[PDB]
Swiss-Prot record, chains A, B:
Family: Belongs to the SurE nucleotidase family.
Record carries keyword Hydrolase: yes
Keyword Membrane tagged: no
Cofactors: a divalent metal cation
Binding site for a divalent metal cation: D9, D10, S40, N92
The protein's role, per its UniProt record: Nucleotidase that shows phosphatase activity on nucleoside 5'-monophosphates.
Annotated protein name in UniProt: 5'-nucleotidase SurE
Sorted UniProt keywords: Cytoplasm, Hydrolase, Metal-binding, Nucleotide-binding
GO molecular function, one term: 5'-nucleotidase activity
Entry EC number(s): 3.1.3.5
Length: 251, 251
């Protein structure tokens, strides 16, 4: 069979998502469960205090009045009649590189697919212009066909970024680590029309660790970037110092 | 004098936060910057699409019309006059164990207090009754007191869960790894007053990986559980295998 669950964070009507769904429709059964509108910065947020409305669209897609994580979670806990085999999230309007991945709703939807039997993919198109969604879609199509022939470890979550170029201009595929940024920009305080102060979250800081081997570098050099993400947040490297510290607390 | 920034995800009115703030005010200068509403499930979502209104309450707590991550992020990028020395989030009404940390606003607040340099603690009280916030407050007091004299690595973020028991009934402190949960409970479908289907996210699933060494195991045996969390999401251990697989993709 191969049943693919697709979601995104740009909203159910986004171009990135429609192109991905059309292209993957040739590989298996595609279900789309996506937010009804733009949910950037949603990260892995779940809506817990309120219930969500859900609408079946004329085109077959399912639109949810909730977050990207809400979409995938609901989809794999009863909203879909049949359990999907993997999650693919995207194609995002914009890159998800380095520190940005921590806040990304696109990455979060993929992460929610860790419960399934096959790898989950998050896919993002770089730049600000978004001219070649078809390139990202082709990359994903290829990854899935291979995953069928050549299994990856279970609970593999791949963060994929694709240069906004024609497929032929792509310089290769690279396994990368997450780059880093410098400190975030300060908050911006303004005064609203009634004289109440308001504060914007500042922009992310400039790229810091962006050298060879990072996702930033691969993208800046026209390579598809593929980063495998941890599903266990335990800092094992810290155990030695922390455990001895806890031992010293016994009085 | 030690500067502590306190936040939470239960909201600025929560008993857990009030107790924690009263207790730690003895150890240093405390600034409280917390959401004006219950933001359970917020994960590290950030408000990017709009500016945030912030207000000072009569008791000196700062109330933010946004997420727990918004609170800490704004607090450390120009809302406050001085950089805090550490961030303490909680005390949460309910445990944050294993998988929970992906969605927890409380954990995210502490985590935001890390990858901008600062040490940080997330603190959660177990169970569903929350009879002994004072116990979690006392535990945190002792850990911070000790941290001042017997320093942990500067990059440390701790996820702390406290059994809901009188302090005298705690069996100890334990370093732990994140356990795992079984599949989450089914979505709960209802109909709204106007005849439209609505769906509630179901409760977290039962403990799966719950044996010796895990946070669940420590909590089940009445120990305070202490898990250090990592800031690098790159799954390095998977690189070599993934790199090899990407080459076969390119074949």
């Amino acid at each position: 069979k191969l049943r693919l669950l697709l979601s995104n964070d740009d909203g159910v009507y986004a171009k990135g998502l429609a192109i991905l769904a059309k292209t993957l429709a040739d590989l298996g059964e595609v279900d789309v469960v996506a937010p009804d509108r733009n949910r950037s910065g949603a990260s892995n947020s779940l809506t817990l205090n309120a219930p969500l409305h859900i609408k079946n669209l004329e085109n077959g897609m399912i639109s949810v009045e909730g977050t990207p994580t809400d979409c995938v979670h609901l989809a794999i806990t009863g909203v879909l009649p049949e359990m999907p085999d993997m999650v693919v999230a995207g194609i995002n309007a914009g890159p998800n590189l380095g520190d940005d991945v921590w806040y990304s709703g696109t990455v979060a939807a993929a992460m929610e697919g860790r419960f399934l039997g096959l790898p989950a993919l998050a896919v993002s198109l770089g730049g600000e212009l978004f001219r070649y969604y078809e390139t990202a879609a082709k990359v994903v199509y290829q990854l899935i066909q291979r995953i069928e022939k050549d299994p990856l470890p279970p609970s593999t979550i791949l963060n994929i970024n694709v240069p906004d170029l024609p497929y032929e201009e792509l310089k290769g595929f690279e396994v990368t680590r997450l780059g880093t940024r410098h400190r975030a920009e300060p908050t911006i305080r303004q005064i609203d029309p009634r004289g109440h102060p308001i504060y914007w979250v500042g922009a992310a800081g400039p790229e810091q660790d962006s050298g060879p081997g990072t996702d930033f570098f691969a993208m800046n050099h026209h390579c598809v970037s593929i980063t495998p993400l941890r599903v266990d947040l335990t800092h094992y490297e810290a155990f030695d110092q922390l455990a001895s510290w806890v031992k010293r607390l016994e009085m």
